[PDB]
Design brief:
It is classed as oxidoreductase. The structure is cut from a larger assembly and holds two copies of chain A (356 residues) and one copy of chain B (150 residues). Chain A is mainly α. Helices cover 61% and strands 3% of the residues of chain A. Chain A has a single domain, classed as Ribonucleotide Reductase, subunit A, CATH 1.10.620.20. In chain A, strands 1-2 form a two-stranded antiparallel ribbon. The relative contact order of chain B is 0.12. Chains in contact: A-B, A-C. Bound molecules: adenosine-5'-triphosphate (ATP). Adenosine-5'-triphosphate (ATP) binds next to helix 1 and helix 3 of chain B.
Chain lengths: 356, 150, 356
């Protein structure tokens, strides 16, 4: 049963990352994992409002940029728009009910809130560079490239929604309704999490970071400034996100917190590896959709693809998964600019002695 | 549409791809060399009727500017981009003409001394053509290359 | 079924406040109810970090303030601590799954986030004025006055959690598990909301605003400055909250959005009225717990009680409910300071004519 306040006085210090008596009180006097606490502070200090950076000069830019290019930028923006639109709610219904410790809780709501800003920003951009917002929005919902990954990751959430729901609404083993038997197994839920979160490490680590090299591409071309300025901040606030997605994964796999999960990490090792490597491919294709009409003075299908390998190759070396994509040197180094801390004695004495 | 002026003289539409492939030919067998890097480095400014030669020229200097200690290969990268331009700017085509044929052509142009056409018969020339390894041009480090161009 | 992204292209413009296809995309190009959008902006601009205002001078204050007074302040702070601690998560699991329009959605997450700050602040205060945080925290969870209302309102949330859950996990009419038949009725859920939210209008309108006159009481005494400074900001960000709780109630009762609810408003008119008037009393008692040992140079049980009547009397005149508490003039006007915009010709000509 889920309680917005748990009655019991339970020492948070020991409550596992997830699956623990729902946090009774919002305190901050201490933590079990200092990480989360810090992620909140650094994020809070990173606060910013999309309306701050000016978008005027950007308007004329889109009007000028070639067709094969105009497509590249309006298309990749639609992709980002969706990612956070969902991510915004997602962390809040999917994880909250499972949150068991205070530090982690506050972070979640903050993590989610941070996304709402990115969502608002993308909107502030469209109105400036396009004539009609709707036409661009109604497409982000009904489009052939868009929907294809859209349902992919978004599924893991809807799953942990029903799964975790029956764990409270109902007990364990078998309950039958209308001739249908649905099993709730504690362990059957601890996996519906470890897998659903490894889907975020990727959407907030590789899926998004890849969608940035595209926006920052126009930046090195002196085009669509406003977007680059805003996008930069996005990546920064994002850094904190994937950073936590790992600390949440690593500690859940170590067992130092959740003993049971320690095993689930092995019987899912191959499972997670699949999603990572597999999902990564989805991106490589997206490039074709942009470089279909034509290449860009900054990069084309060829280049952008190499990136996914370079990033995913390391991105996974952190979580602990196996490395599949070939090793490489960042094809683009110019991108780093945007993820760094975004705004005469003479004597006969000594001579007399030498013997030439 | 977009235009371009091939060194040949004729016109063409811009082919963003054709550039990339060129850089590739260079990045071939190299590391720490970003094909995308050189492009953005060069701030190549496009404008109608731009000569293809000039376009190619831009990347050469750009690649040469990315020759840092951390990027030792870039020295060779740009070198390959350079050797290309030269050979084509003197032969019309990427592959130089036979030892004999060339020696003679340049003779009547006042550039090579006929002194050779007399001390060596066609046979001996076409024979020496064997020793010639044009491919050795791809063993130059741009430092040396630039000097050769003068 | 709950979907973190709905597949369908559905014109938000028409989606009801709640019970509507889950918001597909986070857009802001338009809204059905401009109110929500504004509440977000004004809130975003109200952003602030509790660490900003200094708490040094406050430390010595608590050490000095008499015992009958020390109790008053540490006790009323525990009450606030809990209210937001829960409110923080509450809006996010209880309402989100029901959110049907974009503007409202973004507001919810923001509304919730805003509370997290208040939670963090209360912590920043305790460490300053007390020697040990835990001792004060572990009490906010296990205490006789605290728990008594704690479970009261916190219940409405836990209810809309299970209720709304079966509406997705399961259909309607009767489903029987383990010899138990549980009914899910659409209308049976539209009430579990209208009543659960009228519980917030009160916790964020009368329950909290009453807990402020206590903190601002020491302010007019030149005591516990830091707290007053922080508390002020709290009330401001709060103003936006109850403001929305009404717009959400009024439009849900009008039927201009949800036709069905229009009826539910009448068959719950008396129902809601009960909770309002009833809950209000809970506060009057709380005073005794503070003024038990002794009164305060600023106010005592007598005064503080009068307030609840003056505030609740009007607070309800807005939502549309009937007025039960007797009419009155604010007993305390000094409180307003903290809710306002917180940081010679002479002639014989004219004479000749007079006829004395
Ligand atoms: N249509 C084009 N648009 C842009 N750049 C081009 C185009 N064609 C060639 N280039 C580039 O300019 C450079 C010059 O190529 P090259 O030395 O072979 O002479 P060319 O006159 O361009 O002949 P060709 O293009 O048929 O190979 C190459 O680096 C090539 O990438």
């Amino acid at each position: 049963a889920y309680t917005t306040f748990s009655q019991t006085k339970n020492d948070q210090l020991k409550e596992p990352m997830f699956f623990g008596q729902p946090v009774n009180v919002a305190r901050y006097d201490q933590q079990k994992y200092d990480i989360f606490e810090k992620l909140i502070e650094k994020q809070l200090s990173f606060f910013w409002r999309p309306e701050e950076v000016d978008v005027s000069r950007d308007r004329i830019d889109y009007q000028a940029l070639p067709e094969h290019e105009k497509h590249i930028f309006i298309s990749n923006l639609k992709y980002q728009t969706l990612l956070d639109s969902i991510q915004g709610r997602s962390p809040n219904v999917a994880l909250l009910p499972l949150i068991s410790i205070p530090e982690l809780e506050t972070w979640v709501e903050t993590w989610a809130f941070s996304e709402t800003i990115h969502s608002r920003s993308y909107t502030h951009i469209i109105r400036n560079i396009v004539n009609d917002p709707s036409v661009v929005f109604d497409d982000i919902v009904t489009n052939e490239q868009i929907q294809k990954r859209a349902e992919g990751i978004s599924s893991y959430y809807d799953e942990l929604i029903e799964m975790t729901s029956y764990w409270h609404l109902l007990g364990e083993g078998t309950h039958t309704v209308n001739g249908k038997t649905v099993t709730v197994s504690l362990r059957e839920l601890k996996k519906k999490l470890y897998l659903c979160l490894m889907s975020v490490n990727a959407l907030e680590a590789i899926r998004f970071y890849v969608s940035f090299a595209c926006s920052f591409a126009f930046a090195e071309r002196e085009l669509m400034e406003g977007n680059a300025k805003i996008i930069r901040l996005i990546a920064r606030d994002e850094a904190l996100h994937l950073t936590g997605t790992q600390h949440m994964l690593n500690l859940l796999r170590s067992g130092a917190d959740d003993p049971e999960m320690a095993e689930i990490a092995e019987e899912c090792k191959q499972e997670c590896y699949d999603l990572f490597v597999q999902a990564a491919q989805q991106e490589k294709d997206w490039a074709d959709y942009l470089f279909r009409d034509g290449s860009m003075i900054g990069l084309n299908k060829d280049i952008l693809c190499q990136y996914v390998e370079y990033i995913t190759n390391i991105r996974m070396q952190a979580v602990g998964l196996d490395l599949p994509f070939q090793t490489r040197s960042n094809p683009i180094p110019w991108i780093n600019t945007w993820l760094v801390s975004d705004n005469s004695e003479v004597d006969t004495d000594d001579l007399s002695n030498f013997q030439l | 549409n977009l235009l371009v002026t091939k060194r040949d003289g004729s016109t063409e539409r811009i082919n963003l791809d054709k550039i990339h492939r060129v850089l590739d030919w260079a990045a071939e067998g190299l590391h720490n060399v970003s094909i995308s890097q050189v492009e953005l480095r060069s701030h190549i400014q496009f404008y109608d009727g731009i000569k293809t030669s000039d376009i190619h020229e831009t990347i050469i200097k750009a690649a040469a500017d990315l020759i840092s200690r951390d990027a030792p290969d870039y020295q060779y990268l740009a070198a390959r981009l350079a050797i290309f331009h030269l050979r084509k700017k003197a032969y019309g085509q990427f592959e130089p003409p036979a030892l004999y044929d060339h020696v003679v052509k340049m003779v009547e142009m006042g550039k090579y001394d006929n002194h050779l056409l007399e001390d060596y018969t066609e046979e001996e020339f076409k024979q020496m053509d064997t020793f010639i390894d044009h491919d050795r041009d791809m063993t130059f480090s741009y430092a040396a290359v630039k000097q050769l161009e003068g």
